[PDB]
């Protein structure tokens, strides 16, 4: 009620479930009861290695399908390198555009970021959840503490800490945040992962294609160390990016 | 001798010593004994977090008088991110051009480097000593293993393992390469280095000012976790990067 209006009316620890999203079919394939997707905004850049990443009117348009149907929905917008944007003047204008963006037009419920400033610049501007993806490579207590200080609200922990029972209890008495585990993502103990996420990231911010079998130095060098094992007893959340045959 | 003029002529395991110089007053505190210095060639990307980076015409003078003294030379060119420049097919050449300066130019003797794609060009094209900078946060036995196949003559450890035996005994076992130890340099446990070292990498690779009060967002966010103790036993190279006062 109101002031004026008295009332009086009388009356959540279940893993959450949210599902990658890089197309319109794909969203077909999610699960009904999924609590989310988490949708790549290509053209704001991601460092997450996919096979395929949506142009923007694919993003508005699951969105949009995804809202009807009472999904939650993230941008997935976890460059690690904006390159020397921060660096100019208009650095602050040009991201605080994106993430209006983000926040009234697509209105998304959260964003899952790697980059520290992006995390302090959500936390404090805005009012959407703030996710750490597996991208920052967070496998300690100490970096875990320091993303939290800077205002996360959910770490994605590194795909290494999967089942890793004890690791991830160091971190829970060290945090008070909720845990994220990503399946099917790459570990940063992979050799070169580093290096190609950093590439990636500026391919899809800056609208520059990478062919796996013509321009990706990093593609031939090794076997991808992904992380397909997982402990779900142990996180808050499980990300699923790998559901099946690829969009 | 030659075949028509026979000829009978009859007749090292100390830690080798390498000092970062980043200006030509530098130089002038390198120890009489060291073995090298290790120079920035600032305009060709950096990510070591330096006070000062030299211009071109600075490295050239430096590189000269070092020479003179008789000290070997390595350049330092551990950018941890170069943008979408592997991407277009001028990037081939461009880096081909920049490898032949160093190479044929200043004539260095070797290349500190962290892209994986660096190593495997230098190696292959080049007959310069290949270091892996800390910058590539080299901390297993796995990611020694790539770079050394990546063909890496040289490993910098990530200085977190500065003074433990048990891990830089368990890279010994698997790898062939020579050890070397970065002192006064900061670990990738540090929780926003990764992000640090992009930015640096572009900045000095552009020519964009990065002043610590005015445009680095990375500068107010935490105390870095530089390491200054470490175990030269463990170790076949020491290179100290501050030394006493900054440049
Ligand atoms: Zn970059």
């Not at 899809?204 to 062919?211: Q, R």
Request: aromatic share 8%; charged share 25%; net charge negative.
């Amino acid at each position: 009620g109101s002031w004026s209006h008295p009332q009086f009316e009388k009356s959540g620890s279940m893993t959450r479930r949210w599902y990658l999203c890089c197309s319109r079919h794909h969203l077909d394939t999610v699960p009904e009861d999924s609590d989310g997707i988490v949708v790549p905004v290509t053209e704001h850049g991601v460092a997450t290695l996919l096979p395929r990443y949506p142009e923007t009117y694919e993003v508005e348009d699951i969105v949009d399908v995804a809202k009807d149907r009472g999904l939650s929905v993230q941008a997935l917008m976890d460059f690690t390198c904006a390159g020397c944007e921060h660096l100019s003047p208009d650095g602050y204008p040009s991201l605080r555009s994106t993430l209006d963006y983000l926040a009234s037009d697509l209105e998304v419920d959260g964003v899952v970021v790697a980059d520290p400033y992006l995390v302090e610049v959500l936390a404090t501007e805005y009012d959407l959840t703030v996710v750490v993806s597996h991208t920052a490579a967070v496998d300690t207590p100490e970096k875990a503490w320091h993303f939290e200080r800077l205002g996360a609200d959910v770490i994605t922990v590194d795909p290494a800490l999967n089942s890793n029972e004890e690791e991830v209890s160091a971190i829970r008495e060290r945090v008070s945040v909720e845990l994220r585990t990503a399946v099917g993502a790459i570990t940063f103990r992979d050799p070169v992962a580093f290096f190609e996420r950093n590439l990636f990231s500026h391919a899809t911010a800056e609208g520059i294609e990478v062919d796996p079998y013509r321009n990706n130095p990093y593609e031939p060098m090794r076997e991808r160390v992904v992380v397909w094992e997982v402990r779900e007893e142990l996180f808050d959340e499980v990300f699923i990016l790998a559901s099946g045959e690829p969009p």
